[PDB]
Write an enzyme that holds these catalytic residues in place. Structure first.
Site, PDB file in Angstrom:
ATOM      1  N   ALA A 214     -34.928  29.813  56.589  1.00 32.67           N
ATOM      2  CA  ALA A 214     -33.960  29.298  57.553  1.00 32.67           C
ATOM      3  C   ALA A 214     -32.575  29.021  57.206  1.00 32.67           C
ATOM      4  O   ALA A 214     -31.519  29.716  57.560  1.00 32.67           O
ATOM      5  CB  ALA A 214     -34.708  28.171  58.409  1.00 32.67           C
TER       6      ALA A 214
ATOM      7  N   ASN B 137     -34.800  24.308  67.480  1.00 31.99           N
ATOM      8  CA  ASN B 137     -35.135  25.960  67.895  1.00 31.99           C
ATOM      9  C   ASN B 137     -35.337  25.940  69.380  1.00 31.99           C
ATOM     10  O   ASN B 137     -34.713  26.946  69.901  1.00 31.99           O
ATOM     11  CB  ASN B 137     -36.004  26.589  67.009  1.00 31.99           C
TER      12      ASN B 137
ATOM     13  N   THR C  97     -44.809  29.842  63.767  1.00 31.57           N
ATOM     14  CA  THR C  97     -46.381  30.235  63.598  1.00 31.57           C
ATOM     15  C   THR C  97     -46.759  29.539  62.343  1.00 31.57           C
ATOM     16  O   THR C  97     -47.971  29.865  62.076  1.00 31.57           O
ATOM     17  CB  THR C  97     -46.395  31.895  63.244  1.00 31.57           C
TER      18      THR C  97
ATOM     19  N   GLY D  12     -34.703  28.049  51.512  1.00 27.42           N
ATOM     20  CA  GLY D  12     -35.567  28.494  52.404  1.00 27.42           C
ATOM     21  C   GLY D  12     -35.234  29.684  53.100  1.00 27.42           C
ATOM     22  O   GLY D  12     -34.012  29.951  53.361  1.00 27.42           O
TER      23      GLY D  12
ATOM     24  N   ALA E 293     -44.006  28.763  49.040  1.00 29.93           N
ATOM     25  CA  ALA E 293     -44.629  27.649  49.071  1.00 29.93           C
ATOM     26  C   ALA E 293     -45.578  27.625  50.330  1.00 29.93           C
ATOM     27  O   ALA E 293     -46.467  26.543  50.710  1.00 29.93           O
ATOM     28  CB  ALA E 293     -43.541  26.276  49.583  1.00 29.93           C
TER      29      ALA E 293
ATOM     30  N   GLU F 177     -46.364  22.394  60.349  1.00 31.58           N
ATOM     31  CA  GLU F 177     -44.869  22.262  60.184  1.00 31.58           C
ATOM     32  C   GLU F 177     -44.690  20.653  60.828  1.00 31.58           C
ATOM     33  O   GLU F 177     -43.725  19.880  60.290  1.00 31.58           O
ATOM     34  CB  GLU F 177     -44.032  22.941  61.316  1.00 31.58           C
TER      35      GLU F 177
ATOM     36  N   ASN G  68     -29.412  32.309  64.854  1.00 30.22           N
ATOM     37  CA  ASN G  68     -28.438  32.027  63.888  1.00 30.22           C
ATOM     38  C   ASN G  68     -26.962  32.245  64.093  1.00 30.22           C
ATOM     39  O   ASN G  68     -26.041  31.447  63.687  1.00 30.22           O
ATOM     40  CB  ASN G  68     -28.796  32.814  62.572  1.00 30.22           C
TER      41      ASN G  68
ATOM     42  N   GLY H 232     -42.280  25.655  53.748  1.00 28.96           N
ATOM     43  CA  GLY H 232     -43.005  24.750  52.647  1.00 28.96           C
ATOM     44  C   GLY H 232     -41.686  24.580  51.671  1.00 28.96           C
ATOM     45  O   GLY H 232     -41.460  23.483  50.919  1.00 28.96           O
TER      46      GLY H 232
ATOM     47  N   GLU I 103     -15.880  11.132  55.741  1.00 24.20           N
ATOM     48  CA  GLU I 103     -15.283  10.609  57.124  1.00 24.20           C
ATOM     49  C   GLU I 103     -16.583  10.907  58.283  1.00 24.20           C
ATOM     50  O   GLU I 103     -16.657  10.151  59.188  1.00 24.20           O
ATOM     51  CB  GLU I 103     -14.245  11.530  57.303  1.00 24.20           C
TER      52      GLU I 103
HETATM   53  N1  LIG Z   1     -33.201  29.030  63.634  1.00 19.87           N
HETATM   54  C1  LIG Z   1     -33.480  29.538  62.649  1.00 19.87           C
HETATM   55  N2  LIG Z   1     -34.931  28.947  62.501  1.00 19.87           N
HETATM   56  C2  LIG Z   1     -35.725  29.682  61.310  1.00 19.87           C
HETATM   57  C3  LIG Z   1     -35.153  30.903  60.698  1.00 19.87           C
HETATM   58  N3  LIG Z   1     -36.063  31.268  59.896  1.00 19.87           N
HETATM   59  C4  LIG Z   1     -37.070  30.396  59.901  1.00 19.87           C
HETATM   60  N4  LIG Z   1     -36.997  29.406  60.917  1.00 19.87           N
HETATM   61  C5  LIG Z   1     -37.736  28.356  61.285  1.00 19.87           C
HETATM   62  O1  LIG Z   1     -38.216  27.729  59.891  1.00 19.87           O
HETATM   63  C6  LIG Z   1     -39.695  27.227  60.027  1.00 19.87           C
HETATM   64  C7  LIG Z   1     -40.248  27.967  59.056  1.00 19.87           C
HETATM   65  O2  LIG Z   1     -39.740  27.692  57.793  1.00 19.87           O
HETATM   66  P1  LIG Z   1     -39.217  28.738  56.720  1.00 19.87           P
HETATM   67  O3  LIG Z   1     -37.403  28.477  56.463  1.00 19.87           O
HETATM   68  O4  LIG Z   1     -39.350  29.954  57.299  1.00 19.87           O
HETATM   69  O5  LIG Z   1     -40.112  28.466  55.340  1.00 19.87           O
HETATM   70  P2  LIG Z   1     -39.406  28.574  53.764  1.00 19.87           P
HETATM   71  O6  LIG Z   1     -38.179  27.529  53.821  1.00 19.87           O
HETATM   72  O7  LIG Z   1     -38.856  29.859  53.484  1.00 19.87           O
HETATM   73  O8  LIG Z   1     -40.629  28.033  53.072  1.00 19.87           O
HETATM   74  P3  LIG Z   1     -42.136  28.853  52.691  1.00 19.87           P
HETATM   75  O9  LIG Z   1     -43.056  28.291  53.441  1.00 19.87           O
HETATM   76  O10 LIG Z   1     -42.008  28.824  51.147  1.00 19.87           O
HETATM   77  O11 LIG Z   1     -41.847  30.360  53.346  1.00 19.87           O
HETATM   78  C8  LIG Z   1     -40.003  27.767  61.475  1.00 19.87           C
HETATM   79  O12 LIG Z   1     -39.747  26.532  62.146  1.00 19.87           O
HETATM   80  C9  LIG Z   1     -39.144  28.842  61.849  1.00 19.87           C
HETATM   81  O13 LIG Z   1     -38.829  28.873  63.303  1.00 19.87           O
HETATM   82  C10 LIG Z   1     -34.200  31.338  60.887  1.00 19.87           C
HETATM   83  O14 LIG Z   1     -33.421  32.250  60.379  1.00 19.87           O
HETATM   84  N5  LIG Z   1     -33.131  30.509  61.925  1.00 19.87           N
END
Ligand SMILES: Nc1nc2c(ncn2[C@@H]2O[C@H](COP(=O)(O)OP(=O)(O)OP(=O)(O)O)[C@@H](O)[C@H]2O)c(=O)[nH]1
Ligand SMILES: Nc1ncnc2c1ncn2[C@@H]1O[C@H](COP(=O)(O)OP(=O)(O)CP(=O)(O)O)[C@@H](O)[C@H]1O
Ligand SMILES: Nc1nc2c(ncn2[C@@H]2O[C@H](COP(=O)(O)OP(=O)(O)O)[C@@H](O)[C@H]2O)c(=O)[nH]1
Ligand SMILES: [Ca+2]
Ligand SMILES: [Ca+2]
Ligand SMILES: [Ca+2]
Ligand SMILES: [Mg+2]
Ligand SMILES: [Mg+2]
Ligand SMILES: [Mg+2]
Lengths: 54, 352, 438, 425
Positions: free
Chosen positions: C12, C206, C179, C10, C99, C183, C228, C144, C254
């Site tokens: 993140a 976060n 957003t 995903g 997703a 979640e 990040n 998702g 470990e």
């Molecule tokens: N720390 C950090 N949090 C992130 C980042 N990108 C998204 N998030 C967090 O991840 C959550 C959203 O999930 P995403 O990872 O963007 O969604 P996804 O895994 O790509 O799944 P999809 O619904 O298919 O887009 C939110 O809480 C965001 O604040 C990132 O680059 N760094």
């Protein structure tokens, strides 16, 4: 306050300090869950198409 | 426009604070389950501290210090004094106490008997009092057998401490009393002592040759107003305030309340609250805390002050509600959420 | 030498992965084109850094990593980014539509159709390993894909690699940078299904990273890049033992042995210090006692909670830079006489300490200043249960009305999975309370 | 490459749809001939969402123009940006729909619908990964209302797992063409309840009041009304047309905005709404205060009469993102009684650097509020006032409809009103 297991190397070292002593689902099963949900989706889509055919 | 929630409908103190907050026209009350609040007047038990300070852009403040029960619990207070080096086991202002678990459940049974047997052998006064936090359930006796057997008949932790056999008796009447001090600790851990205290006096003469009738031995306001036949005789509601008590000390003992009693009270308050400051302080925490405490003291005929207990959710004397509650708003709430004297508190300075 | 494979799932997971591998290359002296001058064994070797990098005949050091996302825009950045040359195309997997912040869509609808492909790519990396340790899996709780596809992947990894350890780096949701209203649902659904498949999981809230960036880095409105780069510093400290010579946490097994005595309670709290702004004129260098004392301040924890009101089950101190054991022990002695550190009675009261002499590396032009010594403390505290309570409470508010549930049922998920997942979380919160409270 | 297929049907649908393409074409740097002349890469980044790319670097809107009479689409083809549309994408008849839902849905519309689907299918077949569809139309007429909802039903049959979005203009006595508009709108609303994922409720009653009272337009025209609709449609689609993290695609927006499948009717809002003091700089507090003001709502419902299930806000222009978060949290924390407390953090905010033409900064509001029931109650009462006497029904029974279909539509909308009421308490 006891130190034990001191290990040293050129790039660092590690040790332990003690202050006080003490006192799955199979591949087959994963497939069935994925197919079961797919079947539920297909059933819901069939009902929608049925509704639209009426 | 600030916002607050009420989660303890039985709190007379914060029902007035809530009343005052709204009268300012700058505080709005939300439903008790709305997360977007500035101030939480939390419940007494199981206050969910873990959900505070997680609201973006909201400074949140709660009227309880997480972890202060260590001081406001009978058994907890004993364990705190005995184990904390700041107070030490030789603490000179807390009666000798022991934590006793009923046999139907560490425990200080044997340690208590050793000290008890010593007094019995040395002809010394050997009267103890058994009590617990699960009471409205108190027993006063001079025999260790009765004290221990009374606790086994119960099912909660109890405490056995030395009974002050030489209390200061008010005249006329020859009656016992205790002193209630209200102390406010703000988010910065400033210790404020309310200038006004109350003496919950007994309307019955003190009798040392009969601990069976507990009306003259317990100065509780409810006990005197239910089982005492002289209630309200000497002072209204068995409550004597500092002005009258200070005048008595001068007339009878040629001393003042500040010199003979208050200096010790202020010392004890500082000692207790400073001891636990590292455990409960919210200085670098994602939410802030303040709390109103009720300290209860005993004074012996030597004009020595003893700490009895600390109340975490105290009430207040009827005459003092308006002043104290307004003081809580000024120093504890408005200091964090300012609005658009001659303070009523005594600041007990200390090192943080 | 035993290899570790990193999996980024995903947005993140991918974006954090890009920050980590950027930092890994800087720490090991690997250029963007994959070349490593200091590596005298061309096209081979079993050095510590080889746990994370393979080598081609031409001397390219290739991350042992797979990036997976159901939409292409995030991984497309990697394909055309600074370190594009590090990976070959097989390692970067993208679908065409995501997703939609829907656990059920990532796990069932889309997961069923791409899981076999992802496993094949992971198998290609495994075939290069002479002694695979296991996997490091990076993902968000709220997405998702991060929630739904990760849990499916973890289930299959336990089947296809039964004896391999799996560690998680999981992003706990925070409204300040989130957003997606659902979640909490996705977080609890993925925790329920992943719990029995993960040996050790490092949660990063976060909200904590955001506030550290604003408080310590003087960033008024931190971006994902700011968040990040800080997270990668913490990840680097955690994985440094696997990538450099040493004797503490030298293999994935470990982490469980040192940090998780009870399998379900496998969420260690991470605390990091010092975080100093680079824009500062020039900061005073903190001592070992000072950075060690900083590990017991809630303001530097990866998850805001109060360890003073929990119990410790294990505690590791990971130092980087100019630190000697003498100063660590002296610092520990002082902190015990001031701090409220309570261990459970069935665990020894102590610390495992690791020291790597190489100080932290900072990305040129980043927000973090260079420091002479830093520390990351990994402590298994019952206090992190505060994070579960907060999450379960939001879950309960929405689920009592069945808000948004139709989106999940519409992807073929049964409503009973919600209550099953929630009941598992209730048992988890009860486990913490049994261990931590008297 | 998340493509959207746009459809505009009937007089209202094509006139508002024309202005929409005129506005966003300007924002993306596309001139009336389809050539790009912008000066920022943000304009082309997501251009393929709404535009197809043809030979010579030409951008052609992915739009299908539908009507049962030629008049309005002749006007479009001769309008400002008329030449930018694909000539093959004009599908129209000659009979007209006579402001009659039955003619649009069952007779005249039924004869032309297959040829529209042929064009729709053509546009979808060339999409890398089709997101879904957006339809612009009115509910008070015959073509946009009757044939529009017919099209939605047939599109859902062929694309059951794609998102269906509509901008639906609700009729009002104050800006009305015929007395049967409550009939056509009640029949349509039931279709939308079943077959759309998101519907922007655009109430001509609100557009008129904004023009008359706020803009001080003595005599509002349909053109004045459509200027508000264009600005709104641009605002609500910004998340789809430029780089961003929140919403960003039709399905994610739906997932965050619709907690219950039938309650997908949104109250849009826009700020500023300034009359010709038009050069004064507008602050973030003012943008946020006005955007939540009822007078800035385009549904003609008072938000203080209901509760927000979910809210999406989009700020455009160079501004303090820190200040945006502050004022937004201020509005929520200062009026948290109008937000349901069982959907935590239900107010999401997004920011876009590119402002609309002729504005330093603006704000667009998308609310899923239980107050929208007031709009459906208003239509239901106007429906019943006539239907209790079977007034004007012969226009519909003459096309083969039975009275029972009106009773069922009447019951369906009152059911919808009752569903909003339960979540309001
Ligand atoms: N720390 C950090 N949090 C992130 C980042 N990108 C998204 N998030 C967090 O991840 C959550 C959203 O999930 P995403 O990872 O963007 O969604 P996804 O895994 O790509 O799944 P999809 O619904 O298919 O887009 C939110 O809480 C965001 O604040 C990132 O680059 N760094
Ligand atoms: N060691 C001791 N010596 C003499 N009197 C004692 C005593 N311990 C308790 N008392 C008497 O008991 C009364 C109250 O006891 P205690 O405070 O322990 O019960 P409690 O907590 O239910 C009343 P409160 O909480 O309101 O102070 C006091 O008035 C005091 O006179
Ligand atoms: N806002 C707006 N509303 C319109 C416009 N044209 C018609 N309407 C409204 O649409 C309804 C009439 O439907 P119309 O679109 O003209 O009928 P159709 O051609 O059969 O679809 C009435 O409620 C009108 O007020 C327009 O250009 N703008
Ligand atoms: Ca090598
Ligand atoms: Ca396993
Ligand atoms: Ca015909
Ligand atoms: Mg008490
Ligand atoms: Mg994604
Ligand atoms: Mg018309």
């Amino acid at each position: 306050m006891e130190v034990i297991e001191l290990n040293k190397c050129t790039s660092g070292q590690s040790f332990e300090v003690i202050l006080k002593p003490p006192s799955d689902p199979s591949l087959e099963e994963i497939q069935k869950k994925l197919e079961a949900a797919e079947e539920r989706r297909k059933y819901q889509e069939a009902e929608l198409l049925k509704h639209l055919a009426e | 426009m600030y916002t607050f929630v009420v989660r303890d409908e039985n709190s007379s103190v914060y029902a007035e604070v809530s009343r005052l907050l709204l009268a300012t026209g700058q505080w709005k009350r939300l439903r008790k389950d709305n997360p977007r609040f500035n101030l939480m007047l939390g419940e007494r038990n199981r206050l969910p501290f873990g959900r505070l300070g997680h609201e973006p852009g909201l400074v949140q403040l709660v009227n309880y210090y997480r972890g202060a029960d260590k001081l406001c619990r009978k058994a907890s207070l004993v364990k705190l004094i005995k184990t904390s080096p700041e107070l030490s086991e030789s603490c000179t202002w807390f009666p000798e106490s022991y934590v006793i678990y009923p046999t139907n459940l560490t425990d200080e049974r044997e340690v208590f008997l050793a000290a008890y047997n010593r007094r019995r052998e040395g002809r010394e006064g050997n009267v103890w009092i058994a009590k617990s936090s699960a009471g409205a359930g108190i027993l006063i006796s001079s025999e260790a057998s009765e004290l221990l057997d009374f606790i086994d008949e119960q099912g909660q932790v109890h405490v056995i401490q030395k009974y002050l056999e030489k209390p200061l008796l008010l005249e006329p009447g020859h009656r016992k009393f205790d002193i209630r001090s209200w102390v406010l600790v703000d988010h910065l851990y400033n210790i404020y002592l309310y200038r006004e205290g109350v003496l919950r006096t007994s309307s019955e003469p003190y009798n040392s040759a009969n601990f069976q009738d507990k009306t003259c031995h317990l100065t509780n306001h409810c006990i005197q107003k239910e089982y005492s036949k002289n209630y309200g005789r000497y002072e209204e509601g068995n409550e004597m305030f500092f002005e009258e008590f200070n005048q008595y000390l001068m007339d009878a003992l040629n001393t003042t309340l500040e010199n003979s009693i208050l200096l010790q009270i202020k010392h004890i308050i500082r000692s207790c609250l400073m001891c636990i400051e590292p455990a409960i302080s919210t200085k670098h925490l994602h939410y802030q805390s303040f709390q109103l405490f009720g300290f209860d003291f005993m004074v012996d005929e030597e004009l020595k002050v003893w700490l009895i207990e600390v109340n975490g959710a105290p009430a207040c004397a009827q005459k003092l509600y308006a002043e104290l509650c307004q003081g809580i708003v000024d120093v504890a709430i408005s200091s964090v959420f300012p609005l658009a004297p001659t303070s009523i508190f005594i600041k007990l300075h200390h090192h943080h | 030498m035993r290899e570790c494979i990193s999996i980024h799932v995903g947005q993140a997971g991918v974006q954090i992965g890009n920050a980590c591998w950027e930092l890994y290359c800087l720490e090991h002296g690997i250029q963007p084109d994959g070349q490593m001058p200091s590596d005298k064994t061309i096209g081979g070797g079993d050095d510590s850094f080889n746990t994370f990098f393979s080598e081609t005949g031409a001397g390219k050091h290739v991350p042992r990593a797979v990036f997976v996302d159901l939409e292409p825009t995030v991984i497309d950045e990697v394909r055309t980014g600074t370190y594009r040359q590090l990976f070959h195309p097989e390692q970067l997997i993208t679908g065409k539509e995501d997703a939609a912040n829907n656990y059920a869509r990532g796990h069932y609808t889309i997961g069923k159709e791409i899981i076999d492909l992802v496993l094949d790519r992971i198998r290609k990396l495994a075939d290069q390993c002479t002694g695979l340790q296991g996997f490091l899996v990076f993902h968000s709780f709220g997405g998702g894909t991060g929630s739904g596809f990760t849990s499916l992947l973890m289930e299959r990894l336990s089947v296809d690699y039964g004896k391999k350890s799996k560690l998680e780096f999981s992003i706990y949701p925070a409204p300040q940078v989130s957003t997606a209203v659902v979640e909490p649902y996705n977080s609890i659904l993925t925790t329920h299904t992943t719990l029995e498949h993960s040996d050790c999981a490092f949660m990063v809230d976060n909200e904590a990273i955001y506030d550290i960036c604003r408080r310590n880095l003087d960033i008024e409105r931190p971006t994902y890049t700011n968040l990040n780069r800080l997270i990668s510093q913490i990840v680097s400290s955690i994985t440094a033992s696997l990538r450099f010579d040493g004797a503490l946490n030298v293999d994935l097994t470990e982490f469980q042995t040192n940090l998780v005595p009870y399998p379900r309670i496998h969420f260690p709290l991470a605390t990091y210090a010092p975080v100093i702004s680079a824009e500062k004129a020039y900061h005073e260098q903190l001592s070992v006692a000072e950075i060690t004392n900083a590990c017991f301040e809630p303001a530097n924890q990866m998850v805001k909670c109060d360890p003073r009101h929990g119990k410790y089950m294990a505690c590791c101190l990971l130092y980087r830079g100019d630190v000697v054991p003498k100063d660590v022990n002296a610092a520990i002695a002082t902190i015990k006489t001031k701090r409220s550190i309570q261990f459970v009675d069935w665990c020894p009261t102590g610390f495992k300490v690791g020291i790597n002499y190489q100080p932290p590396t900072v990305v040129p032009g980043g927000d973090l200043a260079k420091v002479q010594r830093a520390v990351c403390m990994l402590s298994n505290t019952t206090a992190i249960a505060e994070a579960w309570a907060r999450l379960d409470h939001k879950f309960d508010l929405m689920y009592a009305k069945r808000a948004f549930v139709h989106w999940y049922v519409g992807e073929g998920m049964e409503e009973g999975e919600f209550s099953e997942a929630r009941e598992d979380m209730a048992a988890l919160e009860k486990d913490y309370e049994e261990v931590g409270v008297d | 490459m998340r493509e959207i297929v746009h459809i505009q049907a009937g007089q209202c649908g094509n006139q508002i749809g024309a202005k929409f393409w005129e506005v966003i074409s300007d924002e993306h740097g596309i001139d009336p001939t389809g050539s790009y002349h912008g000066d920022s890469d943000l304009q082309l980044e997501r251009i393929n969402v709404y535009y197809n790319e043809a030979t010579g670097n030409k951008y052609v809107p992915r739009a299908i123009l539908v009507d049962l009479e030629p008049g309005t689409m002749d006007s479009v083809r001769s309008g400002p940006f008329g030449q930018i549309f694909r000539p093959d994408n004009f599908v129209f008849g000659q009979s007209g729909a006579g402001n009659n839902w039955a003619k649009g849905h069952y007779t005249e519309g039924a004869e032309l619908v297959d040829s529209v689907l042929d064009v729709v299918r053509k546009e979808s077949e060339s999409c890398d990964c089709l997101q879904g569809f957006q339809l612009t139309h009115s509910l008070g007429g015959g073509t946009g209302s009757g044939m529009g909802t017919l099209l939605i039903s047939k599109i859902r049959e062929e694309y059951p797992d794609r998102i269906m979005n509509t901008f639906s203009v609700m009729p009002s006595p104050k800006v009305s063409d015929t007395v049967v508009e409550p009939y056509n709108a009640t029949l349509s609303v039931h279709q939308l309840v079943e077959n759309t994922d998101e519907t922007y409720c655009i109430d001509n009653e609100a557009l008129y009041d904004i023009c008359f009272r706020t803009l001080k337009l003595t005599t509002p025209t349909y053109g004045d009304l459509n200027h508000l609709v264009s600005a709104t449609m641009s605002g609500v689609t910004t998340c789809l047309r430029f780089p961003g993290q929140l919403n960003a695609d039709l399905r994610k927006l739906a997932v965050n905005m619709v907690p219950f499948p039938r309650l997908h009717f949104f109250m849009p809002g826009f700020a500023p709404l300034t009359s010709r003091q038009q050069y004064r700089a507008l602050t973030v507090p003012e943008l946020t205060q006005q955007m939540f003001d009822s007078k800035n709502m385009m549904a003609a419902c008072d938000p203080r009469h209901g509760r927000y299930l979910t809210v999406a806000a989009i700020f455009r222009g160079r501004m303090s993102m820190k200040e945006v978060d502050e004022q937004m949290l201020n509005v929520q924390n200062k009026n948290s009684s109008y937000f349901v407390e069982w959907i935590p953090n239900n107010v999401k905010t997004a920011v876009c650097d590119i402002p609309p033409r002729g504005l330093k900064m603006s704000a667009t509001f998308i609310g899923n509020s239980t107050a929208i029931q007031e709009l459906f109650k208003r239509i239901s009462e106007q429906f019943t006032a006539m239907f209790r006497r079977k007034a004007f029904l012969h226009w519909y029974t003459g096309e083969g409809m039975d009275e029972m279909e009106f009773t069922e539509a009447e019951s369906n909308m009152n059911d919808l009103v009752s569903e909003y009421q339960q979540y309001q308490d």
